[PDB]
Curated annotation (Swiss-Prot), chains A, B:
Details of cofactor binding: Binds 1 Fe(3+) ion per subunit.
Keyword Nuclease (UniProt): no
Pfam families, A to Z: Dioxygenase_C, Dioxygenase_N
Catalysis: reaction(s): catechol + O2 = cis,cis-muconate + 2 H(+)
Pathway per the UniProt entry: Aromatic compound metabolism; beta-ketoadipate pathway; 5-oxo-4,5-dihydro-2-furylacetate from catechol: step 1/3
The organism's taxonomic lineage, starting at the top: Bacteria, Pseudomonadati, Pseudomonadota, Gammaproteobacteria, Moraxellales
GO molecular function, one term: ferric iron binding
Name of this chain's protein: Catechol 1,2-dioxygenase
Gene3D superfamilies: Aromatic compound dioxygenase
Cofactor(s) it depends on: Fe(3+)
Record's keyword annotation contains tRNA processing: no
Taxonomy, superkingdom: Bacteria
């Protein structure tokens, strides 16, 4: 069957998109028209049956009902595709951004407490939590320590859950979420625990689709970062814990060279006392170098819906 | 900045789609691969920003959260487009559709009370309800009256609300929903009330997207039909109440020539008595002609999620 290219279908696509209406947002109509066209065409080229179509419509309802659109998004590579575009654009402007950006993920929560230089991130409610001392220096576009920069960090516990999105409900507000303002040496230091990777809600729509593609929905253990400061663009990045089985097989394709960090294990008494911890702990060092604003503006900051508490 | 047609992105689409993956459903991979390719490309061609992208993702969540995917679908012309593909296929097979098909809509409910020849569809709970006597004849593929045919009818009240989907929740199950088995003369007859047209939930995602397209979301008063019988294909259609303002301006583009019917107003005491009514009533006559199975197969019956109570 071939009717997509006839005048009725073509005219119809213009009507449905409201390209004929006088009111509305021209930008939205432009996009809708393009998307309906490609889909109407895809339905023809692939001879998608009504049965298949409605299975797709039902899937769409499940996805939203389970608020998993922002989880399916990175799994189908959009999140990384948008980053790739951001990189292409910077490369075209001669911006040799040292610390590679990667996806933000849908689990950021605004409002975390902030402090200068140091902060313990966890409430110690994780029985299996392994103490982690994470620290580094923030450098400006010139390679100089940058005091006053705001480092935002958020990660999951050993069960792979983030505060505010813990299915088991446990967690205290902003647990494992802090904003650190760099100190006199442009440094930040936090005490938290090693996060574990995690997968998609096992019975959710995202996992359903992934099984159909013969793929897994697991992410390697990682820590999320937000770094902003005057005169510089906001940095969205993360670090992967070295040795994770999914380090290079992240379902969200967020991993990048330069972002995989080694968690050095310490067990000797001198190290333990020095960092005034209570037993063997792991240490990760990660410095971040920021890029300068582009003609006075942050050409790559993203404004997307983020939960605020 | 263009990266879509480079190797990296093209290989990325194959990976995200599970193409080189051994497990999974290749039909789904095929469709996903096509859809992703088109969306990645549309994003680049229309230079969609992350800000715009994430608003789209947010819309998808609320679309599903509100269980409105099946409502937007017809509003964006998919339901009708699929009917067109069906007509085209029937044409290619030489099947002359006497009674034109049209969209089912997302409001069908399975399990309605069943009766032979006659049925009263309402329970009187609608004040402004105006008595409507709808009756007709079902003809088999050879133009002869067909007894024991199953006619299913469903429609909204004067507030434009359907039972099972009534926000005010004052309707009893299956109100204005009935299955009628045709009598010895292949006839069906029901007593009900003239339905009112209806629109999209005003606060819902479908309505808001329609606003951005400068379109409305109203449908003219109509009555839905499902007609099935042994040896025949299941017919999905609906009749439009003549004179409705939106008759040829339905947001679901379901109106069709041959489906618009005139509600005759009867006020003579002799007619009111012959029809066992308590006063002035409206009458609508609509005969439907079925098509025979194709070699024992119903090549157009649609299997889609339908509420069953
Ligand atoms: C309002 C606008 C509407 C736009 C609609 C989108 C376009 C339509 C294309 C959708 C094509 C879907 C075809 C997939 C399919 O034919 O079947 C998909 C699987 C089913 O698996 P089966 O084993 O065959 O089920 C049956 C098992 N039995 C046989 C034992 C019963 O189920 C699933 O949920 C997977 C569905 C994934 C499709 C979602 C794509 C969205 C991504 C952006
Ligand atoms: C899981 C994978 C997901 C793949 C999805 C890819 C699609 C990406 C395209 C998204 C296009 C949306 C961009 C439109 C936009 O930038 O904003 C959309 C409107 C907002 O109104 P504004 O007035 O512009 O807000 C601004 C007010 N200010 C100016 C005062 C600030 O809101 C809306 O809901 C319209 C959004 C509807 C789009 C849904 C299409 C799906 C149907 C097939
Ligand atoms: Fe994460
Ligand atoms: Fe309807
Ligand atoms: Hg990449
Ligand atoms: Hg998973
Ligand atoms: Hg996942
Ligand atoms: Hg049409
Ligand atoms: Hg509406
Ligand atoms: Hg509507």
């Amino acid at each position: 069957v071939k009717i997509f290219n006839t005048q009725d279908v073509q005219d119809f696509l213009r009507v449905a998109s409201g390209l004929e209406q006088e009111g509305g947002n021209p930008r939205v109509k432009q996009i809708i028209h393009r998307v309906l066209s490609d889909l109407y065409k895809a339905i023809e080229d692939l001879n998608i049956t009504s049965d298949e179509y409605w299975a797709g419509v039902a899937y769409l309802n499940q996805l939203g009902a389970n608020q998993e659109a922002g989880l399916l998004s990175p799994g189908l590579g959009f999140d990384h595709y948008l980053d790739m575009r951001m990189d292409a654009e910077d490369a075209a402007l001669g911006i040799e951004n040292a610390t590679p950006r990667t996806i933000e993920g849908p689990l950021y929560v605004a409002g975390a407490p902030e402090s200068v230089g140091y902060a313990r991130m966890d409430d110690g409610s994780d029985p299996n939590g392994h103490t982690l001392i994470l620290h580094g220096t923030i450098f400006d576009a010139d390679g100089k320590p940058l005091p006053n920069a705001k480092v935002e960090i958020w990660h999951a516990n050993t069960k792979g859950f983030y505060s505010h999105f813990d299915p088991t409900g446990e967690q205290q507000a902003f647990n494992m979420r802090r904003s650190i303002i760099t100190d006199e040496n442009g440094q930040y230091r936090v005490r938290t625990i090693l996060p574990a990777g995690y997968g998609c809600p096992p019975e959710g729509p995202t996992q359903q689709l992934l099984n159909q593609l013969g793929r897994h929905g697991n992410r390697p253990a990682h820590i999320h970062y937000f770094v902003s400061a005057d005169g510089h663009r906001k940095l969205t990045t993360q670090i992967n814990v070295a040795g994770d089985p999914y380090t290079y097989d992240d379902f969200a394709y967020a991993t990048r060279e330069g972002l995989v960090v080694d968690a050095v294990e310490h067990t000797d008494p001198e190290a333990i006392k020095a960092n005034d911890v209570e037993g063997p702990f792991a240490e990760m060092v990660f410095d971040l170098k920021l890029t300068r604003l582009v003609d006075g503006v942050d050409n790559q900051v993203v404004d997307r819906p983020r939960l605020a508490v």
